[PDB]
Prior knowledge:
Number of helices of chain A: 1
Distance between the termini of chain A: 78 Å
Radius of gyration of chain B: 28 Å
Strand content of chain A: 5-15%
Structural class of chain B: mainly beta
Shape of chain B: elongated
Subcellular location (chain A): Virion membrane; Host cell membrane
Oligomer: part of a larger assembly
Membrane topology (chain C): Single-pass type I membrane protein
Protein name (chain C): Envelope glycoprotein E2
Membrane topology (chain A): Single-pass type I membrane protein
Largest interface: A-E, 30 and 36 residues
Largest sheet of chain A: 2 strands, antiparallel
Protein name (chain A): Spike glycoprotein E1
Number of helices of chain B: 1
Number of strands of chain A: 2
Order of helices and strands of chain B: HEEEEEEEEEEEEEEEEEEEE
Distance between the termini of chain B: 62 Å
Helix content of chain B: under 10%
Structural class of chain A: little secondary structure
Number of strands of chain B: 20
Shape of chain A: rod-shaped
Amino acid sequence: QPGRFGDIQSRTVESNDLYANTALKLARPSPGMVHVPYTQTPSGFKYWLKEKGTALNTKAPFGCQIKTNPVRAMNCAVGNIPVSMNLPDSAFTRIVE
Amino acid sequence: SVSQHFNVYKATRPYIAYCADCGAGHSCHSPVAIEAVRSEATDGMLKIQFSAQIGIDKSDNHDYTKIRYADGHAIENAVRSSLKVATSGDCFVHGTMGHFILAKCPPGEFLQVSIQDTRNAVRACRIQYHHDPQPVGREKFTIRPHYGKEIPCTTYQQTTAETVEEIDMHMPPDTPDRTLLSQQSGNVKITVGGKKVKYNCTCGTGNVGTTNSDMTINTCLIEQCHVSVTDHKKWQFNSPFVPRADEPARKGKVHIPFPLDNITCRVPMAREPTVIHGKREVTLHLHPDHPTLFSYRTLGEDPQYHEEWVTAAVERT
Amino acid sequence: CRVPMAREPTVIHGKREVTLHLHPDHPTLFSYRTLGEDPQYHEEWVTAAVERT
Amino acid sequence: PGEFLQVSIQDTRNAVRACRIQYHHDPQPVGREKFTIRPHYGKEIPCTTYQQT
Amino acid sequence: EYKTVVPSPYVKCCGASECSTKEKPDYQCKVYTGVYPFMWGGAYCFCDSENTQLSEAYVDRSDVCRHDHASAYKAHTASLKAKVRVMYGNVNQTVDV
């Protein structure tokens, strides 16, 4: 929708599809001039930057630190980790010793 | 050398365009005409584009003290040292080439770009642009600190290399100029002036053509003919204020001078707060000196997050 | 005396109500009256994108 | 926009005489929009101004 | 952030232009009549009326958003990955699992 997030939507950074519903509308030039006036709703993406809200980095439950490039949540303190261990006899110690 | 970078501008030229203001609230058709401010660097550095060329003299030669500003029908040479790109304060020019200036203006509402023409005048264009840079990070400081962190903020490189970005081009239109036509006591003379003026004379049948010399069609009046030069040697830059010629956008591809690159960026570390312990709670004595952030999340389950901009000393618990 | 026209609002229809995405770029005026009987008027100065209903 | 107004002239002996008073100047352009610089495509409304003549 | 490309108007005065529609994103093409361009230095053509302006504008992705884009992924399944330290006997080792 025009104005909110994703008024401009490319399928991929390099691809060229560019669904661009943005309410770009033209208007007749004023007499005695050669402008090409238009009334386009501002960058919807920019408005998202201003009104993004509290990012998940600051409200993740369980103190999960957030990283981005390989998007991930680190140090998530939740649940238990079952562990199964196969041990060779060399590790153990003889009772008689 | 840099001369290679300017091999493209040999075929271009400045143009006259509408301004709607010149520091006095009046339509200008000023030679200087801001086209589009392109603030896109997290650092904050405008890339004003305007109808002129810096670094190239009137004779299509590299010179870092010359400005090609359009005037009448021929190019001119204006000393570059008279450049005063200034918002509410006064921007510090960070280098220029061709049509794009680089600035670091302070906060303001309007952008004004001015050059001094040959006749020691002050041509300028002033457009509305709500410039309000916000330095990267979480602290809206003003000037760089000395001891601080190093976070990445993208800025416009001074390097004037060739970039993938392009600006369109097309041959100029047929500029009209009534000064060429002049009455001759019942006759009309058209000063060719080394041009290729055309005419759609309504005075007498068959008076249509493109004279290349000082044609002197007689027995006519001023308001019976439309004279207009047809310069086609150099190129203009697809201006919305310049009616394009019949040809559909021959699309010359002058490269945008200044690219955008990822660089480090300094930022201060705010005063450490004076923690005060208490039963199941703290009370911080925040002591800022410029707007900073402050966010605390209870790292349990279903936290109680918070995020606010601290502007003065407070006692948040 | 010249003066600009603010960007046209993005109307959103609704049951007996509309939601407007005002998108100013400088302080403008926004006032609406219900042209019935004993209207519910209103007038305010908007400085940033809002979601008035 | 500003708070004080200063007027200065250069006297004979290459000095700067000036007077500076307090004047809460803050002009708001006519109409319902408090724009800063004239637009290019816009409405035309009547606003009084001093004639240069 | 989008970028509104606005080609210079094709003012075919002393004649009549036609709306040459296109398929660019949100492409807009408008044709006007009874318009009198006033290029600097005088009128733009010998006619007094019967003139046309072929105003056109279309949206396009900003010149630079390989650096300033905002992905819109859709995440469905998680995948844990932990770094663990084990200290038995004397191994003092850490592994990624």
